[PDB]
Every structure is written in structure tokens, then in C-alpha cells.
Design a protein around this ligand. Structure first.
Ligand code: 0NN
Ligand code: 0NN
Ligand code: OLB
Ligand code: OLC
Ligand code: OLA
Lengths: 278, 376
């Protein structure tokens, strides 16, 4: 309703301000402040960059929720939709990369290469990003103009097709790989007390590995409700009650909250980052 | 006690290996003090019994008779008859195997295995029969039946493992190696997750039919239900494959918890509990609850809805005891009595009985299925 969406928007504004502050701060620290351009941080940079982009759209999406329509035209409609998908894909793919990086460190004890991967990650993402941007538009159909992605005819076929594919390749499979990485660490680590190197430097590996795992946990936690719902919507399951809509609005919000959460996680679970703040 | 037990073995083998009376008299000494420090201890098997219960009292008695022979063996050694003191060691090894060993059944596990064999045969027959009927026999590929197909498929896989698990129970170890160990563990988890997730999907499907009778026709196409099954096996693998990797194989088939176990134990224990069982069931509850408030031949809708609910009920009924126990095991609560183990073995069995139950439910509560089973 009128007051419950004000809640949603106020929530966005909060996420927006804190998010940009946090992520921009992170990007700065890694970029110029210090030579802490490590494999993991270059991937973290990639996450912050993505979060930044999507955070910039909350002000726009926020007004659409209030007005009940899209008053920014087509150009910005396509722009927003692209980012939204770019966000999801670059996030998971980057997390996966970070996970493999971790596993390599643990079992096989450069930033340039991590930088290369980020490129490949944005290259893969665009395979869905650009296409969706083209398909997306703001179409005054009946009653109201609105921003959305157009599903080809018949929708009863392509709906499920894109619904399933995007579910698997944007979320499940990446998460699946991530699981394998950590599972393999587990079997490797067993029997490794202060082993595989020297005491002084091991805690970092453990601490940096612990970091990557929490970020993944937190991400998966924030975007799973939305992923399933969106999946269901693709199959034709549509919400038609105030409560249904509300829950959806909040789970969509809950996902966007993930963007501003990362910086705080780095602050609490990463010594180096914890130092550059205060 | 497991410590003292080995302190007795090494000092029992040092005896008849010795070439000096001093090594014997010394070994018998070490061996004696251990029998006393082990007589006071308590075996795991009887950590739930009183210090004066027959089972417990007759465990400290085994250590009396034993110690008595170690005292005797020492008199021979002191009297100078050192050679026939070694002879007394072969006499001890006997006392060790008969009285105290068992404290570290045959016919009740035969029951368990025979139970598996029964569930296995009937299960496969029932489910395979179901998959056939839906697959080829008829164009009864409805949204609900495509989900039922998914359940049967899962039941089929897990049913195939009962023959294998059944022998492990008999032999008391896993004789099939690692490859099959990993394979079996995966299925077992795949089963649990695929089952609940499918039931949830079926429940939502039902709710949609009840509340959206207009848009359900286009929505509850089998093609879409087919797509869901794919997503269900995709979600399941997020735990299935990882567990397969962690799983491996006296020697036994089990999943390895990372160090420290006192932390990760509860972590996986709680997460698997919530996401494999509770949350799915929670959603299901919402679906029916919403039907309640909302509520030609709608008899089908009612009958098909009634069906889904019974299948859920029966499933939850069969897997709740195990879910809680397994949850408790994750928190460190371990069974250490014959009764404890037995109850666990049967509750684990009870779960596997659920696999063969479904086909019968369809036969009794579904007209269409009830008709084709008459054919065969
Ligand atoms: O709907 C809107 N916002 C919410 C978008 C939420 N997104 C949906 C897409 C997202 C991530 C979360 O869903 C799961 C998933 C898996 C893989 C990639 C991307 C996704 C409308 C109304 C307001 C502005 N407008 C933006 C928009 C329009 C059409 C399509 C997307 C966004
Ligand atoms: O232990 C065994 N069988 C019983 C397996 C019972 N499982 C335990 C796990 C299960 C499902 C039921 O319970 C809770 C739960 C929550 C979520 C998913 C799956 C589960 C051993 C002994 C001999 C055969 N062998 C098979 C096996 C070994 C290790 C792991 C699984 C199976
Ligand atoms: C799906 C996209 C996967 C992107 C490519 C896999 C990640 C990777 O290659 O990791 C490299 C690390 O070992 C070192 O940085
Ligand atoms: C947990 C289930 C994972 C699947 C989540 C999607 C559920 C959507 C659904 O169940 O839709 C019913 C309808 O029959 C579809 O055609
Ligand atoms: C979260 C920040 C909230 C900002 C509130 C936005 C206020 C918008 C008020 C009036 C906009 C009306 C737009 C009508 C234009 C319709 C035609 C068109 O958009 O091309």
C-alpha cells in the first residue's frame, strides 16, 4: 500500500547511500591507497564495481514503486535492466572465481591474472546482459506504462525456457562449482595442522578462506528467495494478492541489501580492510 | 578404557615374545595395573546403565577373573618357573576374548535386512509400475503426475541401495569400496531433498488450481511441471555432489565433517535440518492454509488435493524421527546402547519404507492409477 511502499523506498535510499559509501571506499582502498592488490582483492574490486552500478539504480526503481509506473523512458529502462542482470551474473561468477582461487591456494601453496578473469567475467555476463537490454523496454500496454523484459511468443514455451536457463546458469551452477571447491579443500585440509607451509602465514589463508565463504553464504542467503520466485513467475505462477506482492517487494529488496552488506563483511573479517577504515 | 585395553594387549604380546624373566614379570605387572584401571571405567555400550546393573556388574567381573590369572601368572614367575608363566599368557588371551571383548544383535539385524529386501522388491515394482503408466501407457501426463514421476524416480534410486546397505548392516563394514560409497551417500541425500522439494512443488501446484482455476489450465501444463523437476534436481545437487565428495570409506561408509567438528557439526546439522525438511514443510503448510481460507466435477480437485496431502503426511511421518535423531547426532548426542542403536536402525528403516508406500497410496486414493493397476 501507500505506507508500506514508502518503507520499501526509504529502505532503498538507506541501502543506496551506505552501499555507495561502503563500496566506493573499498574500491579506493584497493585501487590507489595501497599495494594490497592481491588476487582476492581484485575479485573483491569486481564485486564492489558491480554493487556500485546496481546501487545507482535504486533511486530510479524507488520512484517507479511510488508512482506505479516508469517515468524515465526507454533508454534508462534498458540501462537499468542490463545492470540488474549484469549484477547477478558478475556477482556469482566472481564468487566462483574467488572460490577456485582459494582452493588453488590451499592445495597448490598474481593480480594481473585475477584482473584477466574479471574481464572474462564481464564478457560472459554480457552474453545475457546485452540481449536482455535489447529485449527490455517500457511499454504502455493497458492502463499504465511500465519497464520490463519482453518474452517472445508463445510465452508459455519461452517463459519456462528462459526461466529455467537463467536459474541454472546465473545461480545454481556457479554455486554448485563453489561447493565443489570447498568440499575439496575439506578433504585436503584434514590432517593439516600448521601444515602446508609455515605457521606465520597460514592463519591468513584460513582467514581469507573464511572470508570468501561468508560472502558467498550471505549472497546466496539474500538472493535465493528472489531466484525461486522469479523462477516461479516464469512458469506462470503469478502473485495476485496484497500480501503476495508485499513479500515479493521485500525479497527483491532483501537482495538489493546484499550490495551494501559486503563492505561491512570485509571490515569485520579482513584485517587489512579493518585497518584502512578506523 | 579403549586406552587401557591396548595397554593390556601390548603387555600381553611382550610376554610370550620376551626372552627374559624380567620382561615377563614386568609385562605382567603393567598388564595387571591396567586390568584394575579398566575395571573401574565404563564401556560406551553401557554408559546409560547403573554401576550395579547386571550388564555392568558382569563387566567388572570379567576383570576380576582376569586379574586373578595375572596374579597367578606372577607367582609362577617369582617361584622361578618363568617358562610356564608365558603359558599362562595364552590362558589370558582366552579370558580377554570371551568375557570382556563383547563389551566394546545378530537376529535383530536379520530382521532389518529382511525388511529392506521386502521394501526393495515391492518398492521397485510399485514405482517402476507408476513411472511406466505415466510415461508411455497413457496421456495422463498431468502437472501432478509429472511430479509424482519425480518422486518415483527418486524412490527408485534409493531403493536400489537397500541391498547394499543391507549387507553393510550384516557384515558390520563396507565391502564395496569408495566409488559405491560416494554413489550411495549422494543418492541418499538426493532422495531427501528431491522428495521434499517435489512435495512442495506439488502443494503449490494444488493451491494454484484451487485459487486460480481460470489461469491454472495454461499454467499447469506438464511441460512446466517438467521444468520444475529439473530445477528440483538442480537445487538438490547443491548438496548432493558436495556430500558425495566429502563421503568415503574395520572400514565404513560415512561423511567426513571438517575440523573442528564441534563447530561444523552443528552448522551442517542445523542447516540440513532447516533446508531439507523444515522450510519445505513450512511452505507446504502455507499452501494448504491458504486453500482453507479460500475454500461440475471439482471432486477431482478435491480428490487430487486430498491425495497430495496424504503423501506429505505419510512422508513427514516416516522421516521425522530420523531427522531429529540425525540432528541430535550432529550436536554430539551419540547413542551408546544396544537399544539406542536398535531404535535408530528401525527409524532409519522406517524412512526407507516410505519409498515403497507411495505407489500404494496412489492406488487407493487416485482413480486413474487405481484403474491401470487393475490392468496389471
Ligand atoms: O522488476 C523490476 N525491478 C526489480 C528487479 C529485480 N531483479 C529481477 C531480475 C533478477 C534480479 C532481481 O531476478 C532474478 C535474476 C537471475 C539472474 C539475473 C538477474 C535476476 C522493475 C520495476 C522497477 C524497475 N524495474 C526493473 C526491472 C524490470 C525488468 C527486469 C528486471 C528489472
Ligand atoms: O548410515 C548408513 N545408512 C543410513 C543412511 C540414513 N540416512 C542418513 C542421512 C539422511 C537420510 C537417511 O538422514 C538425515 C538427512 C537430512 C537431509 C538429507 C538426507 C538425510 C550407512 C551404514 C550402512 C549403509 N550406509 C549408507 C550411508 C552412509 C553414509 C551416509 C548416508 C548413507
Ligand atoms: C564461470 C566463470 C568462471 C571464470 C573462470 C574460472 C575462475 C578461474 O579461472 O580462477 C583463477 C584462479 O585460480 C586464480 O585467479
Ligand atoms: C522448492 C521447489 C523449487 C521450484 C520452485 C518453483 C515452484 C513453482 C511451482 O511450483 O509452480 C506450480 C505450477 O504447476 C508450475 O507450472
Ligand atoms: C525515491 C525518490 C522518490 C522520488 C519521487 C518521484 C516524483 C515523481 C513525480 C512526478 C512524476 C510524474 C511523471 C509523469 C510522466 C509520465 C509520462 C512519462 O513518464 O514519459
Amino acid at each position: 500500500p501507500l505506507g508500506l511502499k514508502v518503507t520499501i523506498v526509504g529502505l532503498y535510499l538507506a541501502v543506496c547511500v551506505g552501499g555507495l559509501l561502503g563500496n566506493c571506499l573499498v574500491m579506493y582502498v584497493i585501487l590507489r591507497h595501497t599495494k594490497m592488490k592481491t588476487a582476492t582483492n581484485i575479485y573483491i574490486f569486481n564485486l564492489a564495481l558491480a554493487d556500485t552500478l546496481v546501487l545507482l539504480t535504486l533511486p530510479f526503481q524507488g520512484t517507479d514503486i511510488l508512482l506505479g509506473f516508469w517515468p524515465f523512458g526507454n533508454a534508462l529502462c534498458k540501462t537499468v535492466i542490463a545492470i540488474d542482470y549484469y549484477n547477478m551474473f558478475t556477482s556469482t561468477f566472481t564468487l566462483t572465481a574467488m572460490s577456485v582461487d582459494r582452493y588453488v591456494a590451499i592445495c597448490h601453496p598474481t593480480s594481473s591474472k585475477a584482473q584477466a578473469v574479471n574481464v572474462a567475467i564481464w564478457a560472459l555476463a554480457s552474453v545475457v546482459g546485452v540481449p536482455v537490454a535489447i529485449m527490455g523496454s517500457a511499454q504502455v500496454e493497458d492502463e499504465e506504462i511500465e519497464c520490463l523484459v519482453e518474452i517472445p511468443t508463445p510465452q508459455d514455451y519461452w517463459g519456462p525456457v528462459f526461466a529455467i536457463c537463467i536459474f541454472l546458469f546465473s545461480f545454481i551452477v556457479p554455486v554448485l562449482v563453489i561447493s565443489v571447491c570447498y568440499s575439496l579443500m575439506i578433504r585436503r585440509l584434514r590432517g593439516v595442522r600448521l601444515l602446508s607451509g609455515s605457521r606465520e602465514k597460514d592463519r591468513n589463508l584460513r582467514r581469507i578462506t573464511r572470508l570468501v565463504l561468508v560472502v558467498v553464504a550471505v549472497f546466496v542467503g539474500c538472493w535465493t528467495p528472489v531466484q525461486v520466485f522469479v523462477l516461479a513467475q516464469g512458469l506462470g505462477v503469478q502473485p495476485s494478492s496484497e500480501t503476495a506482492v508485499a513479500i515479493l517487494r521485500f525479497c527483491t529488496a532483501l537482495g538489493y541489501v546484499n550490495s551494501c552488506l559486503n563492505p561491512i563483511l570485509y571490515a569485520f573479517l579482513d584485517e587489512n580492510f579493518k585497518a584502512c577504515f578506523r
